[PDB]
Amino acid sequence: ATIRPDDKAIDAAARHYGITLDKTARLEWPALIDGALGSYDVVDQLYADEATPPTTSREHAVPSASENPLSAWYVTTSIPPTSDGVLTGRRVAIKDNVTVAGVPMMNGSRTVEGFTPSRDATVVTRLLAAGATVAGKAVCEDLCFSGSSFTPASGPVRNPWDRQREAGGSSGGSAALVANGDVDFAIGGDQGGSIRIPAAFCGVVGHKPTFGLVPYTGAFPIERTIDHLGPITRTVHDAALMLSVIAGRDGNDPRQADSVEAGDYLSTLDSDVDGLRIGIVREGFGHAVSQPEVDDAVRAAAHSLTEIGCTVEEVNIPWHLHAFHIWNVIATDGGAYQMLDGNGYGMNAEGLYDPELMAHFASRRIQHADALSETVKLVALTGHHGITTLGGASYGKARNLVPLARAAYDTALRQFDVLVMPTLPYVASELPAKDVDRATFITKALGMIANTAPFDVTGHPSLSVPAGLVNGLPVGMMITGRHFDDATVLRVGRAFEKLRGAFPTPAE
Numbered sequence: 026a027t028i029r030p031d032d033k034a035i036d037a038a039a040r041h042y043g044i045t046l047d048k049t050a051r052l053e054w055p056a057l058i059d060g061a062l063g064s065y066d067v068v069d070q071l072y073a074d075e076a077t078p079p080t081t082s083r084e085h086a087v088p089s090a091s092e093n094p095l096s097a098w099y100v101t102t103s104i105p106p107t108s109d110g111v112l113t114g115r116r117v118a119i120k121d122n123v124t125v126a127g128v129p130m131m132n133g134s135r136t137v138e139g140f141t142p143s144r145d146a147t148v149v150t151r152l153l154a155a156g157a158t159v160a161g162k163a164v165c166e167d168l169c170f171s172g173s174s175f176t177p178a179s180g181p182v183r184n185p186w187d188r189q190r191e192a193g194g195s196s197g198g199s200a201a202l203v204a205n206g207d208v209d210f211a212i213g214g215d216q217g218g219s220i221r222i223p224a225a226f227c228g229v230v231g232h233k234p235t236f237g238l239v240p241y242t243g244a245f246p247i248e249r250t251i252d253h254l255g256p257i258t259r260t261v262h263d264a265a266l267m268l269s270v271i272a273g274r275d276g277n278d279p280r281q282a283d284s285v286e287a288g289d290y291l292s293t294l295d296s297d298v299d300g301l302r303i304g305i306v307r308e309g310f311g312h313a314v315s316q317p318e319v320d321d322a323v324r325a326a327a328h329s330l331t332e333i334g335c336t337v338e339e340v341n342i343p344w345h346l347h348a349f350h351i352w353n354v355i356a357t358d359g360g361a362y363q364m365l366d367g368n369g370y371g372m373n374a375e376g377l378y379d380p381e382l383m384a385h386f387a388s389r390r391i392q393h394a395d396a397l398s399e400t401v402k403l404v405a406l407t408g409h410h411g412i413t414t415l416g417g418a419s420y421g422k423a424r425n426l427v428p429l430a431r432a433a434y435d436t437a438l439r440q441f442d443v444l445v446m447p448t449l450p451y452v453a454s455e456l457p458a459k460d461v462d463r464a465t466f467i468t469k470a471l472g473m474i475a476n477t478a479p480f481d482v483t484g485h486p487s488l489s490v491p492a493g494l495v496n497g498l499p500v501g502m503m504i505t506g507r508h509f510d511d512a513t514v515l516r517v518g519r520a521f522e523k524l525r526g527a528f529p530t531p532a533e
Contacts, residue, residue, distance in 0.1 A: 146243025309446025
């Protein structure tokens with residue numbers, strides 16, 4: 026039977042709503058609430074009998090310091106494919122915010138550590154059905170709220186290009202393992218650039234697919250309207266291949282529209298791009314906080330596409346800057362409302378939920394709140410202010426502005442086939458010392474998402490490909506296109522890699 030609240034809990038609930046309880050009320054509510062919970066008891070029983078996922082027994086191991094040099098692995102496994110396929114003979118690391126049944130996960134946080142899911146994320150099932158072996162869980166930022174790699178409760182993920190530098194973040198571990206050659210590819214999550222940022226920092230390919238193309242089912246939700254799952258690989262071809270396996274509706278994710286269909290990302294991947302119009306987004310360069318060498322390198326790279334028949338022109342998109350602020354409001358008010366108060370999944374959306382995860386996270390969140398990264402706390406504090414004192418109105422205003430941000434990009438996309446700009450304004454910087462200043466922490470954790478985040482809110486497919494090296498470190502060029510035109514984005518990316526030539530491995 027469902028647990029009932031005690032008298033102080035009832036009183037506390039009343040205070041929360043500004044409801045004052047009379048001595049007579051304090052006496053009647055208990056039985057009334059108990060009666061109301063009769064329905065919860067039934068749901069509890071129905072759930073136990075009709076919707077409790079079957080047990081799963083898989084092996085996992087915590088790597089020793091030796092076998093985990095970059096601190097990129099949370100736990101290692103060897104889950105065999107259920108069928109042979111286009112991924113046969115390949116290993117894949119799974120970002121720790123994505124569930125793999127029978128294998129522990131902590132989403133880089135003390136508030137989730139200790140949890141072992143009962144269901145496999147849809148992407149995991151598809152990967153295994155395509156012949157891939159799941160090699161393990163890759164470390165990610167504390168509750169995925171960091172653009173760097175120093176917020177994981179398990180320690181900072183190190184860039185294989187320079188172990189004293191950041192691997193980028195939340196998917197830092199995934200990118201690191203891929204760049205370091207530990208796995209063929211990885212699944213990453215992207216809310217504000219979490220797939221693209223680490224790919225850029227580590228010099229690998231990272232693709233944030235069109236919003237809703239890849240099912241988020243089974244991944245730890247942050248803000249429903251900006252959650253994306255996508256591939257992190259060493260080459261564009263591998264990204265297209267992985268996308269051909271994970272793309273598609275699964276019927277359990279409310280983010281996926283009825284019209285969503287996987288495209289054909291391989292057939293014309295290597296087709297000529299002669300005549301394609303490429304737009305260099307001016308607002309994507311020369312930010313106050315950035316390294317001009319990076320901007321020039323990427324800029325040069327974008328122009329070199331004329332060598333293969335592309336028309337390259339600069340274009341102004343003022344809304345690109347506004348989109349960042351809109352994203353911020355949505356990720357902050359929405360994030361606190363959903364990820365924290367809603368215990369990851371939140372409510373009011375049809376779909377597949379993970380009640381076990383919600384309960385686990387709920388009990389540990391308050392008990393280990395102080396262990397939360399400073400960025401998550403910033404979101405909790407200002408978000409709480411937006412939700413309560415501000416009445417959520419700022420979130421409502423941001424939402425009403427998204428169509429305009431989306432239309433701004435689509436207008437440019439009518440003049441060009443794809444838009445390009447630097448994925449990041451600078452190269453992997455050194456990790457902060459365990460004594461970092463809270464203000465430094467926040468700026469160093471979220472100061473590199475200016476170009477990536479806007480596309481998380483508008484939903485356009487966005488690809489990050491290694492553009493070159495600056496001071497011996499990777500820099501990435503970001504290619505963005507029309508919704509569900511991931512094929513063209515990948516094709517342009519493939520064309521660029523061919524022109525650019527093989528990109529060096531940190532093992533060199």
